[PDB]
Amino acid sequence: MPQKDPCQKQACEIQKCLQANSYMESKCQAVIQELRKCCAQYPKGRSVVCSGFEKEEEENLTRKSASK
């Protein structure tokens, strides 16, 4: 329920950074890490994108759960 979503902007900036980087998400790892600081300001239920984002933290278990 996106009443307001502080992090939706930053989730946009992942995509926008991508366009600024010709979809090299390798560069946009910084801006994913920005969504992080945004997301972790709150409980995930406050935001749709941050609800994707605390699940990004699960997805990271591929790379390593602790490698950042």
Swiss-Prot record:
Tissue expression profile of the protein: Expressed in many tissues with a relatively high level in skeletal muscle.
Short motif Cx9C motif 2, span: 28-38
Keywords noted in UniProt: Chromosomal rearrangement, Disulfide bond, Mitochondrion, Proto-oncogene
Pfam families attached to this UniProt entry: CMC4
Domain CHCH: 4-46
Domain of life: Eukaryota
GO cellular component: mitochondrial intermembrane space; mitochondrion
Protein location: Mitochondrion
InterPro entries tied to this protein: CMC4 (IPR027179), Cys_alpha_HP_mot_SF (IPR009069)
Residue window of motif Cx9C motif 1: 7-17
Disulphide linkage map: 7-38, 17-28, 39-50
Residues spanning the membrane: none
Entry text on domains: The twin Cx9C motifs are involved in the recognition by the mitochondrial disulfide relay system.
Disease: Overexpressed in T-cell leukemia bearing a t(X;14) translocation.
PANTHER family (alphabetical): CX9C MOTIF-CONTAINING PROTEIN 4 (PTHR15590:SF0)
Family: Belongs to the CMC4 family.
Protein name in the entry: Cx9C motif-containing protein 4
